[PDB]
Amino acid sequence: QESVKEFLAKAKEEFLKKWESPSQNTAQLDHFDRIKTLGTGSFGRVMLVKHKETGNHYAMKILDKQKVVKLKQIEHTLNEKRILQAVNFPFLVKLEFSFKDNSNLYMVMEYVPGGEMFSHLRRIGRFSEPHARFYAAQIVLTFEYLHSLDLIYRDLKPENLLIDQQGYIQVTDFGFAKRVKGRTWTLCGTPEYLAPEIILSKGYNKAVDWWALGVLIYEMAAGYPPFFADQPIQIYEKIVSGKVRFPSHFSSDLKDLLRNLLQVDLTKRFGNLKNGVNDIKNHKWFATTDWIAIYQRKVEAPFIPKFKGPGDTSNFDDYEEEEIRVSINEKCGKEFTEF
């Protein structure tokens, strides 16, 4: 519909203006109080912080420049920040400030206190199909938006989907997102969610996101991912076979959608055909979905996370609390000039 085409054209105009002229250096570390570590990774951490003047809470991603360099994530970290400062969509966590210092890169994101979908899914076991569908619809729209901007997300998994105060998803972690007009080649993503063409070291495209949506929908509705095995090599063999077994409790419509998203041949995969995202949005499994009402956040969510306020960390887990040290000398200044 022309209304959708015009919405996406405007979205792309607005993205490109920020993409071409990225914001930089919009806060500094001593404007915030450190509260709690919300998560950790190979080269950084996410910390709940409070802005000392406004009292607002944020999730501050802190990346150690020297570890970014050593783990070959320079371009990925520059992609992440340049993309996040340029996008704007209801189901993406917003980047509020970014800056760097002698030791670290900082991305100060809105704080979503409801926690990761991962925790909620593991606690309940599996989501009903309507509940999985409510979240899936948000991802479909988010990927429609991102792909229209030539962006591939490349890290869809339940840990990266935060549940907000209204029960809606906010996607976090753009560490593997990239602007790609054709193909790209980097091996990245978590094993259970990788498309076959990534495992096989091919040049791949936005169809890997639609594969990962199939994995996410399966895992939401089953409670476990479709290619589960004990070690990555075994997961990869299952993925490239694409042999999927569906629980008998799945509806026929869900199984049909998943066979088309978990299509090993990327040239036959839903989301990657002539009709693009509309093969997904028009599939029978989504027949009850009001796409506009989802976008406008007018659908009552399947559940509302329990939390006490914008500073509550009870839905995140506990980590050893380590210093945020800032060296007296600048590290890796050249590599991160554009950040």
Ligand SMILES: CNC(=O)[C@@H](c1ccc(Cl)cc1)N1CCC[C@H]1C(=O)O
């Ligand atoms: C203001 N909203 C729209 O123009 C779109 C929309 C929203 C987001 C995206 Cl990424 C694409 C399209 N509405 C209108 C009709 C279809 C429906 C939809 O959400 O599919």
Ligand SMILES: CNC(=O)[C@@H](c1ccc(Cl)cc1)N1CCC[C@H]1C(=O)O
């Ligand atoms: C995006 N938010 C997070 O917290 C991320 C994270 C942590 C550190 C960094 Cl540098 C980047 C990303 N992790 C990784 C998977 C689960 C989660 C955690 O540990 O809770």
